[PDB]
Every structure is written in structure tokens, then in C-alpha cells.
Design a protein around this ligand. Sequence first.
Ligand SMILES: [Cl-]
Ligand SMILES: [Cl-]
Ligand SMILES: [Mn+2]
Length: 255
Amino acid sequence: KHVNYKVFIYDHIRQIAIPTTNLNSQSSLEDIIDESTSCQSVSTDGSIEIDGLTLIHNFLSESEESKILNMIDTVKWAKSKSGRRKQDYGPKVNFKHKKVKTDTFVGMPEYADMLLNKMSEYDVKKLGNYQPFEMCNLEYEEVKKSAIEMHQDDMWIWGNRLISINLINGSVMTLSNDNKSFLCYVHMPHRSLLCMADECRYDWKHGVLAHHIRGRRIALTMREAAKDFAEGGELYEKYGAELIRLGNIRVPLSK
Ligand SMILES: [Cl-]
Ligand SMILES: [Cl-]
Ligand SMILES: [Mn+2]
């Protein structure tokens, strides 16, 4: 990635990013996981907080994951870029031409209610009051060298909060503040949830590197209504209200 950047590591316990010179642009997953444990004993000097980075360890039980995954695998997996394969329960959108098509959007997966309810329980303010606009499951495999390029998700139809859930196996999220020249690594463990919002959503860029992917990982990705497409917004009548109605619909996957 970027050699000149200052590398940081995330302490889940302290909810801060701690500066590390033992970690680098090409650092291995194992090194980042060990630093995640060894950053918990370091001073707060030079430490930074990325607002909107919320990592919940153990969001889903083995039992809860088993039900969601069996429903996911029965559904077909589509081709995608960068070694990824995808299942998209969302509208078809041309971000450049601001066009939304609801032809392929039938609703949201039946497991959605459980995930949304649990997010509200942990924090109603932080993860509650979420209306699903897109729920996309992404397949990453070490053999296929799957990865996602450093990026900021579109902010026109997708809202402040972006949710990624690590299924089957965990990974590391690399976050880049190009202007501030800061690189941070967030280790998302198995059955964990990440919400990227606020500074993380707009100021920082998010990507999953190939060397940080082991075995097969499925990202259950969720997106929320942009305020413009929501009630009290310009596009609600043209596009948002239908999208809320379709998102309220649940596709039966059990079966
Ligand atoms: Cl799979
Ligand atoms: Cl992503
Ligand atoms: Mn993204």
C-alpha cells in the first residue's frame, strides 16, 4: 500500500488506534493479529480515535451463524471483481447517472431481522434505527486471491453506517487517510461486526488485502438509507419510499 504512511493498530478494548513502527504497508495477517494483542499494553501517546469505528467481537453465536450461512449457500453466488463472488439483495444503481432500478430487488434476506434487532440491542443510537437499502454477501477465498481495493462506498444511495459481518473466518480491514497519511489495520475476528460511519465513512478509505484472507470468508454487508432517499428527503417520493417498502419485505430462505 503506502510506505510513507504512519501505521496504527486498533485496540478493541480501548477503542483507540495505537501507533506502531513494527507494522508496515506489507505487514502479514499474523503480525497484525499479534500486534492487536500487544497494542493493549502500550501508552496513549500518539494514539488516535477514528470516529464511527465500532467493532463488536462475538456479534453472532455459532448457532446463529449456522442458520444464516446455510440460507446463504443455498442461494446462488454471482461473479464479481477482485476474486470476489457476490449475493446482492439491493437495488440496481448507476452511481454516475443517478439511476435506480427496482426490477431485481424483491426484498431483504429473512436473517436480516435478527441481525438488525441484535445491532439495536448493543446500541440503539449507534446501530439502531437501520433501514436496509442493500444487503450484499461477499465471498473471499485465499486460493482465488480475493480482495477489495481501498475504497469509499458511494454516498448518494448508501448512508452513513456500513455494516460488515465476518463469517466462516476473520480478516483485517486496512483503513487509509491519504490526506493525513495515516494507515490503520482493524482485525475483525470470526463472528464479529464492524460499523464504519462518520470519520471512518467519509474521511477514511476501507479495503481488505489478499494476504489478510485465510480460507473462505463471507462478508455480510449491509447499507442504510441515505437521508436524501429517506422520508423528508428529495428522492423519497421518486425512489426511497418503494425502496423502504421492498426492504421491509423478507425473502423466504429457510425452505
Ligand atoms: Cl462459501
Ligand atoms: Cl466492503
Ligand atoms: Mn466498502
